């Protein structure tokens, strides 16, 4: 197409902080963050707003439907501000203390007020037109992106949270629905379809999701900064507009990801957003760069090359009817070695050799590959690759074993898919009751100890010689990322004792076994002494950190007032040409600045420690709730928060102990 309008704005736009809003009620304008912590507004002249603080989120929507004005939202890692730009007046200036890493604005399920959802360290929140907490829940890790999409087709939109844990969860008003495990820290979600949402990562992968599966996916360089679904071709179905790190804006399709429209810029793309600037009654598509240029749009031979490739294949087969016996089969085998890695051995029942292996896995290896590649003196039939995943998520290696002779210049590439199970680590060993861990979680299962054997055999790399059916059923694994243990014991009544001192591991085991045995709800009995006492000590340190921060803030405010008065006095001395007192004022200012910088270092270290403590508290809540499936989860979370606002720490721990 052709850019229906273009303009150059002299201000650097922060990438993910862009919004279009009719701040005059009927006159749409652009809001975008900038350096120095200022938010600029382009009316059709640029008007600055002094946030005086490093912005981290920005949107614009209808927060009180009684009036027809868009409210400019501005999030900061410790604040959140709604702003009626027309009649400059704060709708609500809330202080979060959890941060603003990703915000949205819409209507959740069974809530009659458009909420300003937010995402911080590990906890989401929600505020109405006045700033009252109406929604609050805890998630796995740092939230990086949020959007509102009606997964499940019931007319009330659930919210999709992209955790730093590489997961995408869907949250109802209170309940969690589903979670799909992507492969990197999410960065942007955008819904415009019924239950389809477009997602981006920090690998560079831009993709599309139905309910719980990916329509398409494309991984490139220049990881996407901002994705937004629009209808560029006017065919009635939205397409994923994307703005990449180089400048390319590629409007793709929500079908198999085929590029439909393409454009380029001079710098990276800050934000792609829809909004009717030109007042034509139909939406537009504005692309805003990082360097501050805005452009707005209104809504062939390769197959012959494939034919030639097919003819080339036919040429190869006719030539047939660096050579290798045609009956060469690559056979794999997984195992685990302690003296500390999951080994994968590949071999060939011939005299042929494996010149190189190029394993391809998304989140296990750093990068996407881990090419092994023996030296010419080391070549042999069977080659072993050591693997060390960072977390327990079932991965699917796409091995490409380069098969050929010793002195060859061209040889085959045999492709093979092998899945490392969820708990690929934790080799089986012999239980030593002297080293038995004390922390344990207990719960009951339905029936069929044989089905428990099935779960254990399909989610763990147990050796062949294991034979366990019903009664004793005590298996002791030793972790490989640590030295810890993993005791799965089963009794006749159908009670599962997990003796892991780690709590995330027990949570993973419980959730996997619930999703395996088709279980909806469950309540546990968990004890984590050495972890609970640590959380208690963190909770104790919290208020001390708060008080220290308050003292330092008051002191620094006093010194800043002194510095302002001294600047005025120095200006007066300079204007009356009294150089001695001017030098005196500047000496005083130098000393106050040094004191203030010392206090600044102290306060910054204290604030970092306090943020760590808050994230620890929230991760504790989330790991306590995470240990329970279905409704028994939600309860805990609520109770846990209601146990912090009251400082009933013992009852708090009782909520996370029994539920």
């Amino acid at each position: 197409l052709q850019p229906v309008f273009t303009l150059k704005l002299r201000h650097k736009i922060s990438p993910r902080m862009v919004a279009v809003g009719r701040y005059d009620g009927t006159h749409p304008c652009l809001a975008a963050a900038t350096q120095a912590g200022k938010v600029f507004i382009h009316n059709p002249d640029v008007s600055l707003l002094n946030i005086n603080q490093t912005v981290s989120c920005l949107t614009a929507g209808v927060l009180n439907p009684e009036l027809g004005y868009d409210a400019l939202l501005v999030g900061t890692q410790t604040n959140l501000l709604a702003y009626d730009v027309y009649n400059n007046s704060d709708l609500f200036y809330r202080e979060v203390a959890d941060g603003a890493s990703a915000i949205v604005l819409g209507t959740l399920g069974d809530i009659t007020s458009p909420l300003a959802i937010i995402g911080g360290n590990c906890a989401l929140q929600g505020f109405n037109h006045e700033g009252n907490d109406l929604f609050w829940t805890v998630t796995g890790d740092n939230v990086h992106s949020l959007a509102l999409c009606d997964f499940d087709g019931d007319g009330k939109k659930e919210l999709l949270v992209g955790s730093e844990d590489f997961d995408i969860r869907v949250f109802k008003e209170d309940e969690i629905v589903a979670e799909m495990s992507e492969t990197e820290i999410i960065t942007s979600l955008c819904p415009m379809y019924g239950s389809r949402f477009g997602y981006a990562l920090s690998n560079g992968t831009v993709g599309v999701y139905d309910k719980t599966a990916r329509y398409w996916r494309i991984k490139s360089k220049n990881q996407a900064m901002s994705i937004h679904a629009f209808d560029l071709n006017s065919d009635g179905v939205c397409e994923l507009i994307t703005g990449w790190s180089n400048g390319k804006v590629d409007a793709r399709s929500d079908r198999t990801g085929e590029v439909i429209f393409k454009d380029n810029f001079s710098s990276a793309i800050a934000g792609v957003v829809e909004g009717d600037y030109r007042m034509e009654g139909c939406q537009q598509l504005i692309c805003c760069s990082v360097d501050g240029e805005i452009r707005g749009y209104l809504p062939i031979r390769e197959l012959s090359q494939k034919k030639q490739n097919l003819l080339l294949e036919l040429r190869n087969y006719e030539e047939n009817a660096g050579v290798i016996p045609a009956n060469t089969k690559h056979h794999t085998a997984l195992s685990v070695s302690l003296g500390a890695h999951a080994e994968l051995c590949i071999s060939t029942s011939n005299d042929t050799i494996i010149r190189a292996v190029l394993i391809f896995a998304e989140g296990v290896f750093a990068g996407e590959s881990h090419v092994v590649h023996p030296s010419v003196h080391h070549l042999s039939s069977s080659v072993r690759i050591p693997i060390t995943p960072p977390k327990d998520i079932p991965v699917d290696l796409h091995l490409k074993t380069f098969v050929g002779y010793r002195s060859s210049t061209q040889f085959h590439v045999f492709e093979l898919t092998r899945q490392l199970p969820r708990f690929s680590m934790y080799a089986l060993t012999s239980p030593d009751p002297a080293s038995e861990p004390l922390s344990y979680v207990n719960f009951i299962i339905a029936e069929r100890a044989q089905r428990v054997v099935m779960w254990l055999n399909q989610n763990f790399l147990l050796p062949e010689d294991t034979n366990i059916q019903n009664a004793p059923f005590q298996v002791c694994f030793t972790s490989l990322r640590n030295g810890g243990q993993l005791y799965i014991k089963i009794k006749l009544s159908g009670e599962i004792t997990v003796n892991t001192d780690d709590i995330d591991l027990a949570g993973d085991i419980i959730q996997s076994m619930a999703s395996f045995f088709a279980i909806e709800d469950l309540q546990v009995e968990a004890d984590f002494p050495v972890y609970f006492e640590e959380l208690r000590k963190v909770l104790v340190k919290v208020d001390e950190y708060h008080s220290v921060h308050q003292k330092l803030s008051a002191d620094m405010a006093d010194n800043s007032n002194l510095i302002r008065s001294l600047l005025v006095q120095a200006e007066d001395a300079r204007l009356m040409r009294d150089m001695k007192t001017m030098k005196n004022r500047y000496k005083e200012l130098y000393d106050l600045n040094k004191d203030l910088l010392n206090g600044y270092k102290i306060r910054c270290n204290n604030h970092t420690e306090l943020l760590g403590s808050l994230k620890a508290v929230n991760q504790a809540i989330q790991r306590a709730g995470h240990l329970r499936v279905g409704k028994p989860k939600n309860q805990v979370i609520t109770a846990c928060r209601d146990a912090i606002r009251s400082n009933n720490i013992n009852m708090l721990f009782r909520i996370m102990r029994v539920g």
């Binding site: 031979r301 009956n327 190189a356 590649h373 040889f411």
Partner: protein
């Protein structure tokens, strides 16, 4: 201002350089091309479809194709030279000439001037007259192209011979009259008109570094007229031609590249060129011609593409008709539909048969061979080789295994992903293991490789195409010891030369083999005369490395201590390999270290100023956003507020340059103390601290004292 629409024509197999031609035929001309399997063919493109003519039988790889005529008759005889012989066809499928010209290896260039036939070889050059040897030359370097000035507009035949070492030897008979010097190794050259220049004779050359020129070869000296030395238009000129496409009345210059770029140069200044239209193609152009092939009455450019896509760029619009709502798109779509259906049927049945017959015990599974036009050149403006792989099909993944500490930089034109797999450097000899998957349907892949002044060794690259058996082909490039020395034609002897002499029990061919092992750009075949001299030059900083050697003696003069130290070590290693026990005798100019340090000083000064300015760039930018910068900012930092962008984008590359400079300085120090017989591997950290301070006078003091 000019617009050319990309209309595609028949697709032929993979083609070499200058393997396309146009029969002169006022209507549409005919296109003739040669595949790497020997199937020379020709078509006319009557209406949309290629009406093929005399598509011949497969043979050797067609290395060159040229049309000529004996007398002033319209030239129509098309001559090819596939393996070692020149075959000749008329303007139809009747072969008339087959000159065996029994040679050793192959032909790489050939020119037909009526009956005169000037052919090249790896090193050899022959001039025949109707299957009769009349001139024979053996250059010291490989030949890229041969041309003869118009024997009609002039009187004597003066064949020009473009060598690999940046020279054009304009020889007559069997001996060079003189040699013209040109920047970069010449690759193509053709008289710049249908006659050879109005003012008598003119030769237009194009080099592999990317450079055009108009050397006017007189009887005894050349007259340089202009040069099109480029900056952003890097890419080896593989083809060039003259044709009036703009229509002003003077013929324009249609020039191809190696990165797809097709360019038209107009002479609107009436004496000098100017670019008018450029277009990228995603593959490597191998031949360019003017005229018209489709819809006579509109001049167009015919461009032969490496994989064989004989494309045209027409001056006629494509959407000539419309209404309320073209159909040729639908026709081509339907044709490709039907063809892909039937081919899918056939190849699926054949895949079934092949997979079910692969289980046969005694049977063997053969491999589809293919071509990878690689180019391991050396960028001179930088110190980084720029490897460029090309495949006819699309690539799936490229391995980059190494044996040398190497930096793989990023190329914006490249669209692949990178995956630096965790090497070990202790159990595998691989100090580098990369893996560039190529997204979508890309043929060529350009990747940078930066190697230090030392650390010789091999470098492998496994390429896998998107074909069905999915084979892989390995390439072994070499990073030479002195991999940053670009060979030139002259040095400056007034520099402090730290000479060094090797003596004892050499076969001159073996010493030449050592120097080929040790130097980037030297011919493999030992040059005749048993006495050869080469004039090298370090590209990171200008220090010459004159190398002279005879049957049993060698003098390696230099301006750097590092170069001669590396040469000493590597030549001693080669001797210990081949059981020689040679005799070294070195020498030092006690001021050479001062000269090298004075050379280095500006670079370190620039890097430190870079760091110091980029430290304050953002702090000053925070002040810039307020009060509009009318009266307060100091002029000093005001000089940085403008160039902040360039400063910030150079700071991204700074740390590599700083680390390289520190390494070079520490190697210089260690070696210049090693020549005296000492071992000063321990004083390094003090030197590191000094460089963190970088008092140049204290630096030279620490150099001279300890």
């Amino acid at each position: 201002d000019l617009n050319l629409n990309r209309a595609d024509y028949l697709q032929v197999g993979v083609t070499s350089q200058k393997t396309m031609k146009l029969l002169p035929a006022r209507a549409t001309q005919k296109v003739v091309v040669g595949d790497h399997d020997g199937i020379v063919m020709c078509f006319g493109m009557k209406k949309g479809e290629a009406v093929t003519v005399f598509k011949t039988l497969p043979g050797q790889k067609i290395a060159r194709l040229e049309l000529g005529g004996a007398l002033n008759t319209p030239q129509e005889k098309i001559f090819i030279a596939a393996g070692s012989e020149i075959r000749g066809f008329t303007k139809r499928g009747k072969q008339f000439l087959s000159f065996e010209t029994n040679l050793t290896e192959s032909i790489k260039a050939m020119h037909i001037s009526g009956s005169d036939l000037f052919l090249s070889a790896s090193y050899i050059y022959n001039h025949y007259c109707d299957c009769k040897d009349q001139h024979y030359y053996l250059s010291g370097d490989k030949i890229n192209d041969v041309i003869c000035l118009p024997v009609e507009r002039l009187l004597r035949e003066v064949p020009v011979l473009a060598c690999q070492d940046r020279v054009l030897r304009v020889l007559q008979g069997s001996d060079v009259t003189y040699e013209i010097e040109v920047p970069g190794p010449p690759t193509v050259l053709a008289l710049h008109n249908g006659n050879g220049g109005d003012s008598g004779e003119d030769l237009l050359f194009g080099t592999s570094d990317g450079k055009l020129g108009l050397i006017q070869i007189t009887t005894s000296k050349p007259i340089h007229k202009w040069e099109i030395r480029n900056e952003k238009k890097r890419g080896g000129i593989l083809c060039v031609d003259s044709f009036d496409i703009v229509g002003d009345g003077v013929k324009d210059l249609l020039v191809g590249r190696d990165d797809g770029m097709v360019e038209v140069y107009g002479f609107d200044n009436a004496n000098e060129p100017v670019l008018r239209f450029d277009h990228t193609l995603s593959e490597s152009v191998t031949s360019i011609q003017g005229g018209c092939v489709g819809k006579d009455g509109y001049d167009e450019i015919v461009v032969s593409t490496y994989s064989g896509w004989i494309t045209g760029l027409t001056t006629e619009p494509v959407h000539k008709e419309s209404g309320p709502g073209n159909q040729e798109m639908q026709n081509k779509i339907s044709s490709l539909r039907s063809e892909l259906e039937q081919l899918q049927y056939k190849v699926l049945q054949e895949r079934e048969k092949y997979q079910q017959s692969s289980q046969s015990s005694k049977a063997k599974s053969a491999v589809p061979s293919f071509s990878v036009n690689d180019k391991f050149t050396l960028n001179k403006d930088d110190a980084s080789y720029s490897l460029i792989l090309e495949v006819q099909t699309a690539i799936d993944n490229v391995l980059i295994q190494s044996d040398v500490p190497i930096d793989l930089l990023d190329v914006d034109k490249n669209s692949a992903v990178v995956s630096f797999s965790s090497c070990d450097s202790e159990s595998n000899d691989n100090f580098l293991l990369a893996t560039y998957r190529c997204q979508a349907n890309t043929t060529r892949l350009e990747l940078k490789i930066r190697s230090i002044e030392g650390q010789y060794g091999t470098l492998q690259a496994y390429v896998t195409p998107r074909i069905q058996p999915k084979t892989c082909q390995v390439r072994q490039y070499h990073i030479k010891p002195l991999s940053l020395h670009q060979r030139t034609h002259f040095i400056d002897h007034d520099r402090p030369m730290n000479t060094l002499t090797l003596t004892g029990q050499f076969s001159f061919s073996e010493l030449h083999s050592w120097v080929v092992f040790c130097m980037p750009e030297v011919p493999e075949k030992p040059p005749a005369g048993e006495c050869v001299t080469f004039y090298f030059q370090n590209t990171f900083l200008d220090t010459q490395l004159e190398s002279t050697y005879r049957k049993g003696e060698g003098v390696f003069k230099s301006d750097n201590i590092s170069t001669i130290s590396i040469l000493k070590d590597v030549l001693s290693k080669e001797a210990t390999k081949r059981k020689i026990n040679l005799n070294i005798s070195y020498e030092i100019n006690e001021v050479s270290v001062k000269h090298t340090l004075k050379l280095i000083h500006p670079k370190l000064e620039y890097q430190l100023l870079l760091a110091k300015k980029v430290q304050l760039i953002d702090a000053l930018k925070e002040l810039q956003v307020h009060e509009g910068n009318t009266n307060f900012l100091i002029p000093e930092y005001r000089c940085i507020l403008e160039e902040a962008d360039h400063l910030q984008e150079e700071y991204k590359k700074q740390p590599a340059h700083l680390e390289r400079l520190y390494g070079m300085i520490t190697d210089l120090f260690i070696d210049k103390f090693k020549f005296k017989g000492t071992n000063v591997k321990t004083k390094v950290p003090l030197l590191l601290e000094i460089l963190d301070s970088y008092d140049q006078n204290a630096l030279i003091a620490f150099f001279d004292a300890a």
